[PDB]
């Protein structure tokens, strides 16, 4: 009763935002898409040959197959029953990388460097990411001036 | 003409006269200024305005009857060209009617549920100004009495406020007399142009 065709809710989602119409930039193409690359999906309005679907916009998947001028991505899509790994063929203009895995590899490199320093100098490192700790017993300063007294203001329309 | 008891506080999305409505008749109000329309800014110093309190819908016929009552009290108190009243509110929301009996059950149930356009009302937020009257300094109480006569005619509860600003502009009456003479404000009809300092120098050379 909504007449579920292809892209029936995409008035804003597959649109180039503002002051960014025209030809596609070439650094979108000039990227290294190997296997296992955790990449995002963000649809385009210029190239109509490789729109994934309206359901896969903003999702994040893993590359399994690479071809001449597209790529193949496995994406966990949620349906009524349970989430499913689905094999999609999306062109290159719709795909950018995800920097979360890059930050994790930076943390792995720093942990390997700290473990090398630990094995070298016998120094304990605490390489586990502890979360935001409670504030320690720090010591404030109020020199020079008295604390400014604040009062609530009267009501004026 | 249905009563205003059945068309009240907002329960629908705004449905304006547009490409998709195409069927609303003409509104009751057509004009919006009644006083001295060509009044300059330095002529009438103060203004009193009428602030709503309830998130309601005011009808165009209510705006008509209220502006007629306020105009009549103004021309009986301070005469013609001694005031300038502006209805700030403009009606755009189109209410709908689902009429029947056109004493029988055998014409229409709830089959065609969507209704035809009846008239135009105006969605009013809390604090939105209904009317504003600018006058002289000596006509302080007459604006109060005119908006008080309009208060009994608008539905719901609403208050009156004598503004700190100099008339219809957004600048203060305390700063107006000291600041239009030195640098910034230049009168342009009933409105006031505020110039910044980020202009070309030809504007400053045309001044002074």
């Amino acid at each position: 009763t909504n007449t579920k065709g292809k892209r029936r809710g995409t008035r804003y989602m597959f649109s180039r935002p503002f002051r960014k119409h025209g030809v596609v930039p070439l650094a979108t193409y000039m990227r290294i898409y190997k296997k296992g690359d955790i990449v995002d999906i963000k649809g385009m309005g210029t190239v109509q040959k490789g729109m994934p679907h309206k359901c896969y916009h903003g999702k994040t998947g893993r590359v399994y197959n690479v071809t001449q001028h597209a790529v193949g991505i496995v994406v966990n899509k949620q349906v009524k029953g349970k989430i499913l790994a689905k094999r999609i063929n999306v062109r290159i203009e719709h795909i950018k990388h995800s920097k979360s895995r890059d930050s994790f590899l930076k943390r792995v490199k720093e942990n390997d460097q700290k473990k090398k320093e630990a094995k070298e100098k016998g120094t304990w490192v605490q390489l586990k990411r502890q979360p935001a700790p409670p504030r320690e017993a720090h010591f404030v300063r109020t020199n020079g001036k008295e604390p400014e007294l604040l009062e609530p203001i009267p009501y004026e329309f | 003409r249905r009563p205003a008891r059945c068309y009240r506080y907002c329960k629908n999305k705004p449905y304006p006269k547009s490409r998709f409505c195409r069927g609303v008749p003409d509104a009751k109000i057509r004009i919006f200024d009644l006083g001295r329309k060509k009044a300059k800014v330095d002529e009438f110093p103060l203004c009193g305005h009428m602030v709503s309190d309830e998130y309601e819908q005011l009808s165009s016929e209510a705006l008509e009857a209220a502006r007629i009552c306020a105009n009549k009290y103004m021309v009986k108190s301070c005469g013609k060209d001694g005031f300038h009243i502006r209805v700030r509110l403009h009606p755009f929301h189109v209410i709908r009617i689902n009429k029947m009996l056109s004493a029988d059950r055998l014409q229409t149930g709830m089959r065609g549920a969507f209704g035809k356009p009846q008239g135009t009302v105006a969605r009013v937020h809390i604090g939105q100004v209904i009317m504003s009257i600018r006058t002289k300094l000596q006509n302080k109480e007459h604006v109060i009495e005119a908006l008080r006569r309009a208060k009994f005619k608008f539905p719901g509860r609403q208050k009156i406020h004598i503004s700190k600003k100099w008339g219809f502009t957004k600048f203060n009456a305390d700063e107006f007399e000291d600041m239009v003479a030195e640098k910034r404000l230049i009168p342009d009809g009933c409105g006031v142009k505020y110039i910044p300092n980020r202009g070309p120098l030809d504007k400053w050379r045309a001044l002074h």
Partner: protein
């Protein structure tokens, strides 16, 4: 005789009665669905690995075990 048409009420609760599952277990991912020219690369590479890997990798393992 008009009935209720469609709803999604009392559906997510039935979904979470049984613990919505990731597939969560794919070691050595499934190989079908990949470019047949790449398959003509990989299968011929695998069968010539089965054929001609013996002596060079054996002597290399002996060399790295002698040097290690």
């Amino acid at each position: 005789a008009k009935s209720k048409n469609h709803t999604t009420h009392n559906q997510s609760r039935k979904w979470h009665r049984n613990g919505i599952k990731k597939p969560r277990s794919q070691r050595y991912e499934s190989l079908k669905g990949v470019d047949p020219k790449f398959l003509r690369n990989m299968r011929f590479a695998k069968k010539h690995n089965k054929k001609g890997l013996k002596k060079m990798q054996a002597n290399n393992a002996k060399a790295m075990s002698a040097r290690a």
